[PDB]
A paper describes a structure:
Cellular protein synthesis takes place at the peptidyl transferase center inside the large ribosomal subunit. The newly synthesized polypeptide chain passes through the ribosomal exit tunnel. Here, we show that oxidative modification of cysteine side chains by glutathionylation, nitrosylation, and disulfide bond formation can occur inside the ribosomal exit tunnel during the expression of the mammalian eye-lens protein γB crystallin (GBC). In this contribution, we integrate liquid- and dynamic nuclear polarization (DNP)-enhanced solid-state NMR spectroscopy, mass spectrometry, theoretical modeling, and cryo-EM to show that oxidation of cysteine residues in the NC can occur within the ribosome exit tunnel in ribosome nascent chain complexes (RNCs).
To determine an atomic structure of the NC containing an intramolecular disulfide bond, we prepared a sample with a higher oxidation ratio of 63%. Thus, the shortest construct U32SecM with four cysteine residues was used to determine its cryo-EM structure. Of 266,000 particles, 210,000 were occupied with one tRNA in the P-site, while 55,000 showed electron density for two tRNAs with the ribosome in a rotated state, indicating two different stalling mechanisms, in agreement with previous reports. A disulfide bond between Cys22 and Cys32 is visible and an α-helical conformation between Phe150 and Tyr28 is found. Interactions between GBC and the ribosome involve hydrogen bonding between of Arg31, Ser30 and nucleotides C1259 and U1260 of 23S rRNA and between the Asn24 side chain and the phosphate backbone of C461 and C462 of 23S rRNA. Interactions in the lower region of the tunnel include hydrogen bonding of the carbonyl groups of Ser19 and Ser20 with the side chains of Arg84 and Arg95 of L22, respectively, and of Tyr16 with the phosphate backbone of A508 of 23S rRNA. All these interactions potentially stabilize the α-helical conformation of amino acids Phe150 to Tyr28 and the loop formed between Cys32 and Cys22, and bring these residues in close proximity to form a possible disulfide bridge. Notably, the residues between Cys32 and Cys22 are also located within a loop in the native structure of GBC. In close proximity to Cys22 and Cys32 are Phe150 from SecM and Arg95 of L22. The formation of the observed disulfide bond between Cys32 and Cys22 might be enhanced by the tight space inside the ribosome and the surrounding amino acids.
Author numbering:
A (entry chain z): 3 to 28
B (entry chain 6): 1 to 46
C (entry chain c): 2 to 272
D (entry chain t): 1 to 93
Write the structure that this text describes.
Amino acid sequence: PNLQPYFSRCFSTPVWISQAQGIRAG
Amino acid sequence: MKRTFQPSVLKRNRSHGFRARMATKNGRQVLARRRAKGRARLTVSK
Amino acid sequence: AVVKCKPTSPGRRHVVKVVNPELHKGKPFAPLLEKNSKSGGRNNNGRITTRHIGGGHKQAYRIVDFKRNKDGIPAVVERLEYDPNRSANIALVLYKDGERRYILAPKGLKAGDQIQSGVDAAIKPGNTLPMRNIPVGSTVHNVEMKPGKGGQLARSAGTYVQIVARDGAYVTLRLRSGEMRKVEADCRATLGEVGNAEHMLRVLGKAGAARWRGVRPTVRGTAMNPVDHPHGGGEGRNFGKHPVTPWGVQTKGKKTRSNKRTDKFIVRRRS
Amino acid sequence: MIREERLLKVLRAPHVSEKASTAMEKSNTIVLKVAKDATKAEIKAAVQKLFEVEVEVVNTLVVKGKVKRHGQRIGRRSDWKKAYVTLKEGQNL
RNA sequence: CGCUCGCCGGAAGACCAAGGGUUCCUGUCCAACGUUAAUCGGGGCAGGGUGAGUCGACCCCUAAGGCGAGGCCGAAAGGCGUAGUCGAUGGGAAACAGGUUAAUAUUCCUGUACUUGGUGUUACUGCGAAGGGGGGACGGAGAAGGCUAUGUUGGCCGGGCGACGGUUGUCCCGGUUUAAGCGUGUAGGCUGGUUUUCCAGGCAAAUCCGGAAAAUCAAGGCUGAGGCGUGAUGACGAGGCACUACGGUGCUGAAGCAACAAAUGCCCUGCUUCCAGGAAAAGCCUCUAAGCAUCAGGUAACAUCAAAUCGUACCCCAAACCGACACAGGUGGUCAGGUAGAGAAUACCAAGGCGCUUGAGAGAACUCGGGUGAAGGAACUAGGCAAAAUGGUGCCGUAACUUCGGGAGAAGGCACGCUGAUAUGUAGGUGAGGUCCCUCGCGGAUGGAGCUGAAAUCAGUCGAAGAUACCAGCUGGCUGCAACUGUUUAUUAAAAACACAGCACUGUGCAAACACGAAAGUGGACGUAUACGGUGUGACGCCUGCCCGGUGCCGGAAGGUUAAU
RNA sequence: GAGGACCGAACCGACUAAUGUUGAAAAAUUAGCGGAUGACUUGUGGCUGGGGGUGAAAGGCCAAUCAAACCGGGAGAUAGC
């Protein structure tokens, strides 16, 4: 079948909520 | 591990089913808003 | 009697049991039982309206006759029985016409004793009479406050009231807290005092012994956050506040009786 | 006792399978596609009246419709009911 | 496909529920999908496949809880709740074994059953409920005994006679299966039995239940595994044999016993014991009332018919479910063989299932994961972190302190293999035929073959080492804190924090205080001051000093001030 | 033959270390670790709803979201930045 019926966008963002170590003061 | 969605049709149809939506005023407004949108499936039912 | 347990464990060391060999070793009388399901402290709205309730052992409600309306019919106490729904023990009596009832157990009451309700009975523990016929100073229990309603006063395990005076259509009773309270003399009362008077001597010993009575743990308001209890937070152990309920109403002394309908029947509040 | 025009509407089609033909040769069982609301009594009444034979026991099942993808969409075939009519000893059709 | 090899085997196997929804099977294709190739696939495509009186749902019955006629409340929406009606995760009804398909089977087929309901005769006939009473019907733990599943060995039966020494023996391999149902009714367990009279009980009224005496017998009834008969000269059956593509299908088919050890399964919803005192309703049995007349029903046997309708394929510790994935995770119940072992641990295996969907080389550093080390032994480091070590059973032995229980496996020793005898296998366990008596049959007493079998001591022996693997405690001393078990920041904090039993103070007289709620109402509680709520403290031991000015609370109300009016 | 007794699997947890950190995994693996007849654990239903619940109390949890969930609306809030 050389028809090309492709797919689409099929879920959103899990997490950009990511690592956070690194400071200069507290 | 244990994820948030553990399916059960009985707990589904008693929460979001058609008769659960048609029991209250605010669920018949849900079904009114889903006919007014044009939704294919109205509830979770079939 | 009371008996201290041998400390073979922590949680067994401080236990004091209150054993009664006079109690029935068997299943209770089945017609006088009833399903008693727990609440959790939850009302019909489903919200907790009384904290620290929940869990515990399954209990079946025993229908106890507090009214004692079988007047003039002699009964005989078949056996004393444990009741998980109250502090006293209960007495399966059997009237002469073949009806079994549950009454509260008086102090001097054993199996094989006679009891008799009615105004023409004798003055002995287990007999129920209206207080026009009971002599003054008699220790009585299971006292009705309204004539024909059922006993409400003096019903816990080793409790009693004294008919300390009587004139007119009103006796006046010294209740177990020290309150002198007037009650109309047509109310019934059982003679003697309630029987399980060794109940205040038992020690639970361990935390789960309270847990299998249905008493969930009490979180101390000072150990909470300011959002939860008016006893706030604080960096460390701080108090600095007058002690209050979780809803900001002052404990440690503030009187909360406001009932102007029944204070005409109280002649002296408790000391 | 079933009305006659009801019996003329339950037997849809004789079903050919090579399991159905094994049942016809070895257990005297014709396998019919029937109507969806067919009861085992209505099939028994219709095989006897319309095929002019005798029937011992009708066994039925409901075949689920396969989901197929014709072109680019997702269709679903119809559920259909399938009887297993066991004739007693004399076989006509 | 084959032959090896490795791996799992309390699972990585078999099977249900959930959830999914055709992934099942077959023939086809190999674009994409599949972390590579693919002829293969849970991919594409087209067929095929799910068979029920008995299994499940439906159904009858209710629990929590929902909804709730009237009802009570509430600006409205609506909240609550009575009758009632729903709601399983519980209670009610009945099938097993072989055979079968490429794929379905307690469903199909053979065999043998069984359940409920509608319908046709007998004698003696009182049958009859939105009612009464039974019953259903219920906890934790513990202890056996009786078994059985199952296993193990012997016997029997079929076959073998050894690719390298030996192997016609006390050899080797394999099999030695069979159910519901029906019959009998015993190991057990429960319980006095029966008539007769009377009555303020069970709203009635009851010949039932409960009560009360009274005669007569405790010798009566329920209950209950498992056996043993039947089912069954049947089925199944190791293996040969035409069959024949030797796959496979097809016809045959011998033995089919016994002893011992056995559950966590059954007897048992029992028994004993504890306190924390352990659903409900129907089906069921039974009593009658209104009713009802050789009507209507009931009862028995016999005969007929009826048992609908849905689900039924497949996955289920998973590539089909939940995790975006063919995802090292999560996921209820059931079954659970051998050899060691206390064991569902562990090691190795069976039945069974797989080798985890990129390989081939090479044998640098470095990094993971391990192994081993001279001499030293904590010198490392924030810190014995990590690793090493300890580890079993029996016996001897064991301190301060102690709330007298503990500490305690304190510490610390020693004995362990194999062979032989004691004893051709003991102590025990089991138990045959035989003997003997009866209430003579699933007996009882004795009997003691057969079978099974520790443990111990002497002696001998082997090795560097005998709990040889896996498995499996490091120990002690002095202190802080918290009595303790427990709980806690899902996802950087498990603690000294929280809880706690106890303690005290305080409120609270029941239409309780409190709480939820504009309310009704409901929790508290079907409880009632030996009870409940709130607060603080936190076992236990010894204890709890002084201050009432401030701030609260409590009590007083003469005065001063003071609202609406 | 008791026990919030002891040892120890299932089970429930989560103390330590290493790995992992564009992971096999949006919290896991591996080796040890604590509880394991109970204040246990688990299934299936139910019930409590957002200034609200529930909390052996951490501001914990309430659908990978929590010192006030999510969705839609006011709404193109306002924003001397």
